[PDB]
Amino acid sequence: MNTVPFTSAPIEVTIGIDQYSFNVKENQPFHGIKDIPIGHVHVIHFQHADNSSMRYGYWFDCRMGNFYIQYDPKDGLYKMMEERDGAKFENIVHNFKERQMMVSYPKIDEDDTWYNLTEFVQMDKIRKIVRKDENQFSYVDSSMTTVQENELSDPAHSLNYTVINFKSREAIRPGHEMEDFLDKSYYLNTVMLQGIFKNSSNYFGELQFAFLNAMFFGNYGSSLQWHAMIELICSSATVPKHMLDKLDEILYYQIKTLPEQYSDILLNERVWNICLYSSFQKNSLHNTEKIMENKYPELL
Amino acid sequence: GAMNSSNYAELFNNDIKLFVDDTNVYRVTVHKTFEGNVATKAINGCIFTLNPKTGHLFLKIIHTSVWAGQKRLSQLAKWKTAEEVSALVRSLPKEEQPKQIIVTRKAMLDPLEVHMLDFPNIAIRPTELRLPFSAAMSIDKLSDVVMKATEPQMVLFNIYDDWLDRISSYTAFSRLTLLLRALKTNEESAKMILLSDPTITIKSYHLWPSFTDEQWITIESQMRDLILTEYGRKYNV
Numbered sequence: 001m002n003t004v005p006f007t008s009a010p011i012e013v014t015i016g017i018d019q020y021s022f023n024v025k026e027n028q029p030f031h032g033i034k035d036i037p038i039g040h041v042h043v044i045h046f047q048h049a050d051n052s053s054m055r056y057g058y059w060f061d062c063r064m065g066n067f068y069i070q071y072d073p074k075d076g077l078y079k080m081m082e083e084r085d086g087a088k089f090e091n092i093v094h095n096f097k098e099r100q101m102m103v104s105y106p107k108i109d110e111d112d113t114w115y116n117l118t119e120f121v122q123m124d125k126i127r128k129i130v131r132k133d134e135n136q137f138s139y140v141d142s143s144m145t146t147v148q149e150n151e152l153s154d155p156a157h158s159l160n161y162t163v164i165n166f167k168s169r170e171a172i173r174p175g176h177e178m179e180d181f182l183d184k185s186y187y188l189n190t191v192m193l194q195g196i197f198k199n200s201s202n203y204f205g206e207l208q209f210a211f212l213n214a215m216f217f218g219n220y221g222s223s224l225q226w227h228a229m230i231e232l233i234c235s236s237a238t239v240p241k242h243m244l245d246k247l248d249e250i251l252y253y254q255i256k257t258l259p260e261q262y263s264d265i266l267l268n269e270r271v272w273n274i275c276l277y278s279s280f281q282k283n284s285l286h287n288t289e290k291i292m293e294n295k296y297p298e299l300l
Numbered sequence: 301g302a303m304n305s306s307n308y309a310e311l312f313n314n315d316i317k318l319f320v321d322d323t324n325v326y327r328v329t330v331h332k333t334f335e336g337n338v339a340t341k342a343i344n345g346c347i348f349t350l351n352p353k354t355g356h357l358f359l360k361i362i363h364t365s366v367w368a369g370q371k372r373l374s375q376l377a378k379w380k381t382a383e384e385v386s387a388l389v390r391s392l393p394k395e396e397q398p399k400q401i402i403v404t405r406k407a408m409l410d411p412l413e414v415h416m417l418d419f420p421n422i423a424i425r426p427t428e429l430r431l432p433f434s435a436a437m438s439i440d441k442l443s444d445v446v447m448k449a450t451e452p453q454m455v456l457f458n459i460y461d462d463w464l465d466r467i468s469s470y471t472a473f474s475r476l477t478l479l480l481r482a483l484k485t486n487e488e489s490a491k492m493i494l495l496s497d498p499t500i501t502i503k504s505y506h507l508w509p510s511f512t513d514e515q516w517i518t519i520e521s522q523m524r525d526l527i528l529t530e531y532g533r534k535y536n537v
C-alpha cells in the first residue's frame with residue numbers, strides 16, 4: 001500500500017481521495033493519506049472551505065514515483081510534488097505513520113467501486129489529455145475547458161479529449177450522409193475505435209476519465225465528453241457484443257456512484273432518454289436502465 | 301438564426317439566398333387493397349427551391365422511381381431533398397451559390413446541414429413564418445411538368461413572371477405569398493378569380509395571367525377577401 005504525505009494543512013479544506021472525502025480544519029495536524037491501493041490510478045482533490053470555486057485535484061499512480069502535497073501560500077492551493085530522494089520520503093512517511101497523523105484510504109474489502117470506475121483508465125493516457133510532461137501527475141479543475149469547447153482561454157491548460165462531432169466530415173462519409181448520420185457505426189468502429197483509440201479499452205478509459213472529471217470537479221466539458229462517447233455507441237447499430245456488455249457495467253457503476261443531489265447538472269436528459277429508449281442499443285443496457293429508472297426516474 | 305417578421309427585409313438584400321420547401325417531395329394517394337387493407341401509391345413530387353429576390357425557381361422533379369424498394373420514405377424524402385439542394389449548390393458557379401438557405405420545415409435542418417458540410421460558410425436557417433409554398437402544386441404549369449415527368453428532371457421557372465420589370469422583390473414576394481395563401485385555403489375560388497376574365501391570358505413563358513397594374517390591385521383584393529371569407533367559413537368567427 002502507498003502513501004501521499006502532506007507537509008501541512010494551513011487552510012481549511014475538504015480533501016477527496018477517489019470517492020472518499022474528509023474535512024480538514026485550518027492548521028489541523030494532518031500529514032496525509034496512507035494504505036492507498038497499488039494497481040489503480042487515484043485522484044486527490046480539494047475544495048477550500050473559504051471559497052467553493054477552488055475545486056481542483058491531481059490524477060496520480062503511486063507506481064510512477066513518490067508524491068506529496070504541500071500548500072503554496074503564493075498560488076493559494078495544495079500542490080502535488082514528486083520527492084526524487086526515495087530515503088528522505090520513506091523517512092518522512094515513517095514519522096507521520098508512527099505519530100498516526102495520516103488518514104487511511106478507507107477501502108471496504110467487498111467494495112470494487114474504484115476498480116469498476118477506473119478499469120480502463122491509464123495514467124500514461126491521462127498525461128496525453130492533460131499535457132504537462134515535467135510532472136508524472138495531472139492537475140484538473142472545475143474551470144478547465146476542452147480543445148473542442150475552445151474551437152467554438154489558454155491552450156496549455158486545456159483537456160485534450162478526442163473531438164467527437166456528429167455533424168463533421170470526420171463523422172460523415174461523402175455519399176453516405178443519411179446512413180452515417182442515422183447509424184454512427186462507421187464513425188464508432190472505423191474512425192474512432194480502429195483509427196484513433198486503436199481498441200475498446202482505450203475508448204472506455206477516456207469515457208471513464210471524462211465521467212470522473214465531471215463528477216469530482218463538476219467540469220462541464222468533461223460532462224459533454226462523457227455524454228458524447230456514450231451517445232456515439234448507443235447511436236451505432238453495429239457494436240461488438242463485448243463492448244455493449246462492458247458499457248452496461250461501466251455506466252451502471254457511474255450512475256451508482258453519482259451523488260443523488262447532482263443528477264440535475266451532471267446528467268443530460270436528451271442523451272439518456274435517447275440511449276435507453278430510442279437508440280439502436282435501447283435493449284443492450286439492462287443494468288444501466290434498471291439503476292437509472294430506480295434512482296433517477298424524474299430525468300426520464 | 302431564425303427568419304421571422306423582424307428580419308423579413310433581409311430576403312430582398314443582395315446576399316444570394318434560397319428558400320427550400322420539401323412539402324411536395326414525397327406525395328401519396330392512400331387507397332384500399334382488395335383484402336380491405338390500406339396502401340399508398342406514390343406520385344411524382346418536387347423540391348421547391350426559390351430565390352425570393354430574383355424569383356428564380358429551381359423545380360427538381362422527384363420521380364416515383366426514387367422511392368422503389370426504399371423504407372421510411374417520409375424520412376428518406378428529407379435526405380433526398382438535402383442531397384438534391386447540395387447537388388444544385390455544387391452545380392452553380394461560386395458567385396451564384398447562396399450565402400444562406402432557409403428551410404420552411406425544421407426537420408430539413410439536420411439533413412441539409414449534413415449534406416452541406418463541404419459549404420461551412422452557407423448558413424442553413426429555419427423560419428418562424430408559415431409560408432404557403434405547399435400550394436406550388438396548385439400552379440397548373442408546375443403541377444403539369446411534375447405529373448408528366450417520366451424521369452428525374454430539373455425545370456427552371458421565374459415564379460414572378462415579368463413582375464420585377466414593374467415592382468420590387470418585396471412587393472413581388474408579397475403578391476406570390478398572397479396568391480399561394482389563397483390557392484392553399486380555397487384552390488377552386490382562387491383559380492376562378494385568376495381566370496374569371498377570358499380576355500386576360502397566361503403567356504406561354506409565364507405561370508400567372510398578364511394583369512395590368514390596376515387589374516392586379518383588384519385580383520389582390522379578391523384574394524384577401526377569399527382568405528377572409530374562408531377564415532369566416534372555418535371558425536364561423
Ligand SMILES: Nc1ncccc1CO
Nearest residue numbers: 121122125126205206209
Ligand atoms: N485509456 C485512457 N485512460 C485515461 C484517459 C484516456 C484514455 C484513452 O487514451
